[PDB]
Design a protein around this ligand. Structure first.
Ligand SMILES: CC(C)[C@@H]1N(Cc2ccc(C(=O)NC[C@]3(O)CCCN(c4cc(NCc5ccccc5)ncn4)C3)cc2)CC12CCC2
Length: 198
């Protein structure tokens, strides 16, 4: 069901098996550099979410290495790395050895995805910093062109992240808003009283 959908939850505890399979996963984790310990990141049930497709994993500091570890543990191979060059409104550029002009997003592949439009965008994003920790909306356009019309899931998103074709998970969203019939049914079965606990 195309319009935006979301679930307020602790991603550590939600049974993500009810959600189905997704062509694209995006995660912007609170790396321990509401944070998650390294072991909790490792233990996230990312493997059930996809059979063939792509993972986009934002990283920084030592999560550049830790994120590669999770990516590989979850069953992915890193095949690209997007950098977002942060600018102001005049298109000028906005870790203790160098000043940081960029954020990194690892791209991992699982299985053998077919029908994706690889090569349409390049791996550099130039976009204005909106707010603190707010990723650029350009990433959704790149992902939509890469995999048009397919179903997608974002982990650790905020209300401003919700998008059509996307299911957004995060503990700062407002309630549960699910419209896909298969998802609603499996959610009701797993969560008859509408509460997520362990
Ligand atoms: C360079 C990259 C890395 C950079 N990212 C940094 C970033 C900064 C903010 C957010 C963020 O604020 N997310 C909303 C939030 O709700 C916050 C609350 C925690 N989060 C949970 C946690 C949870 N369970 C465990 C748990 C453990 C203890 C207590 C509660 C829960 N389940 C669901 N959500 C998520 C996300 C990423 C932004 C970039 C991309 C551009 C720069």
């Amino acid at each position: 069901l195309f319009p935006p959908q979301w679930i307020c939850c602790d991603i550590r505890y939600l049974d993500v098996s009810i959600l189905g399979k997704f062509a694209v996963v995006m995660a912007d984790p609170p790396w321990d550099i509401g944070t998650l310990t390294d072991d909790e990141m490792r233990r996230l049930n990312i493997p059930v979410l996809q059979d063939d497709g792509f993972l986009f994993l934002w990283v920084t500091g030592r999560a550049m290495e830790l994120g590669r570890e999770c990516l590989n543990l979850w069953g992915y191979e890193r095949v690209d790395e997007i950098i977002w060059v942060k600018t102001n409104q005049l298109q000028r550029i906005i870790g203790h050895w160098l000043n940081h002009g960029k954020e990194h997003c690892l791209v991992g592949v699982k299985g053998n995805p077919q029908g994706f439009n690889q090569g349409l965008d390049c791996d550099v994003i130039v976009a204005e910093v909106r707010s603190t920790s707010h990723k650029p909306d350009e990433i959704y356009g790149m992902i939509e062109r890469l995999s048009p019309g397919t179903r997608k899931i974002e982990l650790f998103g905020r209300p401003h992240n919700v998008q059509p074709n996307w299911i957004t998970l995060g503990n700062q969203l407002d309630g549960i808003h699910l419209l896909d019939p298969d998802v609603v049914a499996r959610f009701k079965q797993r969560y008859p009283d509408g509460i997520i606990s362990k």
